[PDB]
Amino acid sequence: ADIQTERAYQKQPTIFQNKKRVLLGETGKEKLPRYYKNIGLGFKTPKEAIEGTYIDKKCPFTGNVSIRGRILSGVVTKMKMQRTIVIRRDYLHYIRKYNRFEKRHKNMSVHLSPCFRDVQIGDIVTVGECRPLSKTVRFNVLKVTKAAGTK
Amino acid sequence: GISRDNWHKRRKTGGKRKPYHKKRKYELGRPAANTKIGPRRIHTVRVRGGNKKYRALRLDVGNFSWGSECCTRKTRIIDVVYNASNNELVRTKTLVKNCIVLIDSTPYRQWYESHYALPLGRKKGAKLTPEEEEILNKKRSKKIQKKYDERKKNAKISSLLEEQFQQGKLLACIASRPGQCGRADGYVLEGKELEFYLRKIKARK
Amino acid sequence: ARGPKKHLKRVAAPKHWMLDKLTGVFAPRPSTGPHKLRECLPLIIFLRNRLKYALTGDEVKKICMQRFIKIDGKVRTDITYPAGFMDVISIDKTGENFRLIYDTKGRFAVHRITPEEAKYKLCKVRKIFVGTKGIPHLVTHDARTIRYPDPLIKVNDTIQIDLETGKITDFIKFDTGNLCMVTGGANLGRIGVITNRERHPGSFDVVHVKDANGNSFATRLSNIFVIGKGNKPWISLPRGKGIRLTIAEERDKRLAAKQSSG
Amino acid sequence: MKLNISFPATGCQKLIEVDDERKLRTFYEKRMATEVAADALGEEWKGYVV
RNA sequence: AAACUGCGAAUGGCUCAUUAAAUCAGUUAUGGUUCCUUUGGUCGCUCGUACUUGGAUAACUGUGGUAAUUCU
């Protein structure tokens, strides 16, 4: 069913899947109600989260996290983990003895919700700070924009 | 003792780090509560801040819910059949959170017959004590028989719940965490969750 | 540390207490109470350093535990009891009443008030919540909980409350054009009318305030205490009226005062 | 070995030194609060149990 | 006086061995937690011998043990 790929039954804790309904409603349509919310800072909840079917407890829009604290950006560099990506933040650090700059970088592991598809290497991602979700992830993807050179 | 600090582990680069302080009492871990089925034996724990944790070591009775119709009853745990974390805990009959349990179904059948007045989990022979014809086949008034008619208009439940009542023991999921609560509360499995757990149990064999 | 602290070093004390360096190594260390440690004036500093009835801390204790000092109408014998903004101090033996409000330099002025003005005080509403059985509560800036407030009273509004009973008697909204006093930050002690509140979601709001002399200054929303409705304050103000003079006009005023007398 | 004998009804007590192993075999290999008839302790202790 | 009970002894004082994104500083978060105390609120909101309940244990009295202890 492309949903129950685990050894426990995956469901959204807030929605109830065992409502007692009539035969006409049974023959009408078999669509579950879906829990979603807004990451309310001028961030639009995507349609793939509202109309989707996936289950992710660490998703900003459908899971159990809240976005509070910093909001940063990065470029996607690696996408080889399961529901998390590794992004890169480049910056310039000012050495004031020389009055010059050196280029520095920080690698950041962020949680990518399944509602963001067609995320490529090099696309600009906007992440927001949440509570600790694993040992090394603290930020959660909220927006994706493509690279300006790509059509 | 058991320490659940983050500084004993390695760094994100994989290098090892030196501790700058020794183990603190706010970083402690306690030995696990392997709650089992048996007559009630629970131990209270003093925790951080002078508050109380209840550590259940032997439990046999909880309360469980039909959520389709919002009715819960205090009943008995009978057996452990599935655990998504470890099958060794099924073999040891360990009560944890989200372990699949089968429980006694007598209060639920009792409420269903005292409310909807239809037989539940009954054989073709249907030999009943006279209290059951008193409950199922009482004498009522016009308003009451009418209200019962629109009550049995929708009093049809799933065939799988019928099959489990035919068997006599209901499947449920323990939703409380018993080593911290001293209770093994939960909810009766229904719907796609019920077919999931049935096919996983059958796929174990 | 292994637990909470009980001592305050004198150089680490709040600077607006105006303690000196050589009297001791310790400062009076305010008790826990309705005010923060950094935003209060303890009773020993008031009775000894400012008001000068006492010469030592032992004399402060002898004054306080003869049951002479009321704070907000309640007799206090804790010598380090944290008194703070808008708190009324009453000495019935000498017939004196005070409100702890700020100078233009950010220090608690010795502000004498009329005994009818000592009947009430103002509080800034810090939270509104509904508790069990649907009962609305407000929490003020001085740790007061009042049940059943007016439904129009919101957070950042100012209640005018009666010290005899403790109930809500009047209130003032947060609105552009109301009079306010600044209780934190670099503009501590200044008074003016609110002219613009800009909102930053997920962050601190910035309120713009205009002085009675036309000077304008901004603060955070946490630092604003609404005092009077529109233009007239609902309490007595100190000798300076919230007008921060620069160092040049303060020198000129000092020289004119020295010239006029002497 | 010495014996600290106490009598609670009149609340009176006394220390008595007895050195003969035959008199102490009535006390050996038994536990605290094990009731013993102290007959072999002396001629005056016939009906006395301790 | 003693002794039981309550509280404090987790503050203060000392030193700089450890410790290299660790500590620490500035900035943010707890919408992810605990909090003696102070202060305010709540404390006939429960439909089910009381004009006062029970057993001890110190201090005290008396007998003691060990070379020795703030032992008993």
Added chain:
RNA sequence: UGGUGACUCUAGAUAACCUCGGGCCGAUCGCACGCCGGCGGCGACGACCCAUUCGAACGUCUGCCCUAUCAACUUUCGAUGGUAGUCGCCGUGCCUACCAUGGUGACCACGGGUGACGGGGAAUCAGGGUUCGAUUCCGGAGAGGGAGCCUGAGAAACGGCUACCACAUCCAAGGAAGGCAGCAGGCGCGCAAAUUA
């Protein structure tokens, strides 16, 4: 109902549960005594919960000296991520089970060193810098070395306890007691530092 920028918030309703190692709903103490046996004013002490105060504890972003005669490291023994739980005051590979093979690195990882506790700060001073900051304020760490607990709101406490390691005190030889990187003081060390007031 009420709130936030955003709740799975707060409040409401239903069905029940409510731990014997047990959650509240006062068998407590003083002073003045007074009204129509019954009604009472000040307090003190307790008290489940909520808020506040004093914190604490875990996270965010940015920032540190020398070394390549340290160039690949982490990953069986958790390394990086997912799902379910355990433990924990709580978030979390904190731990367990099953999975995926990931995570970091010439923008210097990993390793090693430092005559390295970090800052506020000090000397110099046209300016940039250079050297110093064991040391009275703030934060951390430790109590001979390790480790483990009890009590308590709070400690992995050492002017608390229990072991082992290294030292070491008394003894009738069975046993008992120990921790000055507190104030003085002593020995040692040394070029190097005060009174058992």
Added chain:
RNA sequence: ACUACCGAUUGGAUGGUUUAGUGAGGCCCUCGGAUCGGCCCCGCCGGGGUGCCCUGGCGGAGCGCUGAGAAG
């Protein structure tokens, strides 16, 4: 005669990473049950509603029912 290096002796001791094994002491769990108390039974027995019952103090046995509980 002096200064400064190498050095057989697994020379003797000591420490830090580790392979294998042993492991004090606390904590948790499952037992254990020295001791200590209550109920029931009976005996010595006081009163009433007039031998039915209970009232209070002492003793006796019953692995009867139990509750607290040390060492291990």
